Paper text:
To produce complex crystals, we mixed hGPC3core, mGPC3core or murine GPC3 residues 31–488 (mGPC3488) with Rattus norvegicus Unc5D residues 32–307 (rUnc5DIgIgTSP). The complexes crystallized in two different space groups with different crystal packing. Strikingly, all three datasets revealed an octameric assembly. The center of the octamer is formed by four Unc5D molecules that are aligned in a “head-to-tail” antiparallel bundle. Two GPC3 molecules wrap around each end of the Unc5 tetramer. Each GPC3 chain interacts with three Unc5 chains, forming interfaces with the Ig1/Ig2 domains of two Unc5 molecules, and with a TSP1 domain of a third Unc5 molecule. Interface 1 is located at the C lobe of GPC3 and interfaces with the Ig1 and Ig2 domains of Unc5D, burying a surface of ∼690 Å2 (mGPC3 complex) or ∼640 Å2 (hGPC3 complex). The largest interface, 2, is formed between the Unc5D TSP1/Ig2 domains and the M lobe of GPC3, burying ∼1440 Å2 (mGPC3 complex) or ∼1330 Å2 (hGPC3 complex) of protein surface. The buried surface is ∼390 Å2 (mGPC3 complex) or ∼360 Å2 (hGPC3 complex). Within the octameric arrangement, the antiparallel Unc5D chains also form interactions between themselves, especially at the Ig2 domains: the buried surface amounts to ∼900 Å2 and ∼840 Å2 for the major antiparallel packing interactions within the Unc5 bundle.
Author numbering:
A (entry chain E): 154 to 301
B (entry chain C): 61 to 185, 191 to 307, 314 to 348, 382 to 433, 455 to 476
Write the structure that this text describes.
Amino acid sequence: YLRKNFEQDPQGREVPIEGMIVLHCRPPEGVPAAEVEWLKNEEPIDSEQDENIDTRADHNLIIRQARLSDSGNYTCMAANIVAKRRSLSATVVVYVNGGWSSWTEWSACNVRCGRGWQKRSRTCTNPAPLNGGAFCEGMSVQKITCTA
Amino acid sequence: LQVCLPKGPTCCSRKMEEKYQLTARLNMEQLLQSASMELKFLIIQNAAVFQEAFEIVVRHAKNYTNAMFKNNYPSLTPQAFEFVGEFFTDVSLYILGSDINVDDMVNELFDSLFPVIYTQMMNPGLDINECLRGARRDLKVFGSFPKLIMTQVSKSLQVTRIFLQALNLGIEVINTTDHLKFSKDCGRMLTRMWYCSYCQGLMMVKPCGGYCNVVMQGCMAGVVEIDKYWREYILSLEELVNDMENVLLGLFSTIHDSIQYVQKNGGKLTTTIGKLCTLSSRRRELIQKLKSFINFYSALPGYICSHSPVAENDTLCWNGQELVERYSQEPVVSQIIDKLKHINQLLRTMS
Ligand SMILES: *[C@@H]1O[C@H](CO)[C@@H](O)[C@H](O)[C@H]1NC(C)=O
Ligand SMILES: *[C@@H]1O[C@H](CO)[C@@H](O)[C@H](O)[C@H]1NC(C)=O
Ligand SMILES: *[C@@H]1O[C@H](CO)[C@@H](O)[C@H](O)[C@H]1NC(C)=O
Ligand SMILES: *[C@H]1O[C@H](CO)[C@@H](O)[C@H](O)[C@@H]1O
C-alpha cells in the first residue's frame, strides 16, 4: 500500500549565488520503501553528472553553489511497485545582492572661473543584481563644488 | 628553487623568485586590464547614460501628468499629485529591478483616481471611500482603459528593466576578466617566460613567440570557452534593441480619455453608486560599437602575446629554461558562463 499524502514536501527557497541549500523530502508511508527521485522542472537530475549536486540516503538534495545548479521548480517523486506519487514542487530561485563599485575619478570643473562642478560615479555592478536581487542602497553620483 | 629550473648556477634566491612571481601576477593583470579597458569604459558610459536618461524620462512624464491634471482637472488636485507620484515612483522602482507588479500599479492608480472623480466632479458633497474603490472594479467604470495602459506600459518596462540588467551584468563579467586568478602552474610558467631569464644573468633576452603561444593557450583554455556565450550575449542584445519614452509620455492623454469615458456615463453611474453606497540612436550606436568586440575572448591570448615583449622570429630567444637558437615546441569562469547563460535565456525570451 502506497499513500497519496507526502510525509514532508520540499520547500521553495531563496539562496544567494554562493549559498548552499538542502531540499528535504520524506516520501509517503509504503511497503516497500519508496524510491525518491528528484526532478528539476519535470526532468530528472543526474547526481553523477555534477559535483555540486548529490543524492543522499535520507532523500535530500544538497546544492553547495547556486552557480552549477541555478533556479527551477524542483519536485520530489516517490516510486514504488504499487504506483508513483508526486510531491509539491519547490520554487527555488537564486537571488544576487547588489554591490557597490569603487569611486571613479573627479571630473574637471566645467566652469573655468568661479563655481565649478566635480563628479564621481558609483555603479551597481560589483556584483550586479540578478533574478530580482536587491538593488544597491544609497546614491550613485557624487558632486562637489570647486573653485578654479 | 620551485620555479626557475636551475641548469647552471643562478643569481636569484627563492624570495627573489616569489618577487618575480608577484610581478608576473601584476603584469598579467595590467595586460588584461589594458585589453578590457576600452570595452569596460564603453559599457560603463552607456549604462550610466541610459540609467540617467530613463530617470529623466520618468520624471518628465510624472511632471507632464501633474501639469495636465493642474490644467484640466483642478478639482482632482492635490490628491491627483499623490497617486501620480506613487505610480511613477513604482514605475522607477520596477525599472531598477525591484519586485513591482505593473497590473497592481495601474489598478491602484484607478482605485485612487475614481473616488475623487466621484466626490469632486460627479457628486459634489472619507468613510465611504472604500465602497467607491470597490465599485470602480465591480462596475468596470473605466472600461478597457486600465488593461490598455497595463499592456502598453508592462511591455516597455520589462524590456527596459532587462536591458539595464544586461548592461550591468556585461560590466560585471568584463570587470571579472582582468581580475581572473589563474592556476599556480600558470603563475610559474609566466614567471619563467618573463623573468626567469634574469636569474640566469640575461639582461635583454625576450621569450619566444611560440613559447608565449603554448603558455597562453595553456592557462586560457577555460577563458576561451566563454567566447560562445559572449557572442550569444552580443547577438541577443542586438535581438532586444530591435519604445518606453512614447508610452510614458502619452500616459497623460490616455488617462484624460479614460476620465472623459467615465464622465460620459455619469447619469447612471451617480444614481447606481448613491444607491449602492535620441534614445534609439544611442542603442543603435551602442550595438554597432559592441559588435566590434565580439572576438574579445578569442583574441585575448593573441593580445597578451602581441603586447608582451616576445621574440616573434623565434631566434635567440628564451624558452622558459635556457637561451635557444630556435624554439622546439574554472570556478570564476563557471560563474561567468552561468550568468551569461542566464542573461542570454532572459534576452532571447523577450524575443
Ligand atoms: C514554475 O511555477 C510557475 C508558477 O507561476 C510557472 O509560471 C512556471 O511555468 C513553472 N516553471 C518554470 C520553468 O518557470
Ligand atoms: C514642470 O514644467 C514647468 C515648465 O516651465 C516648470 O516651470 C515646472 O517647474 C515643472 N515642474 C516639475 C515638477 O518638474
Ligand atoms: C572592478 O570592480 C571593482 C570593485 O571593487 C573595482 O574595485 C574595479 O575598479 C573595477 N574594474 C575596473 C577595471 O575599473
Ligand atoms: C556599498 O556601500 C557601503 C560601502 O561604502 C556598504 O554599506 C556596502 O558594502 C554597500 O554594498
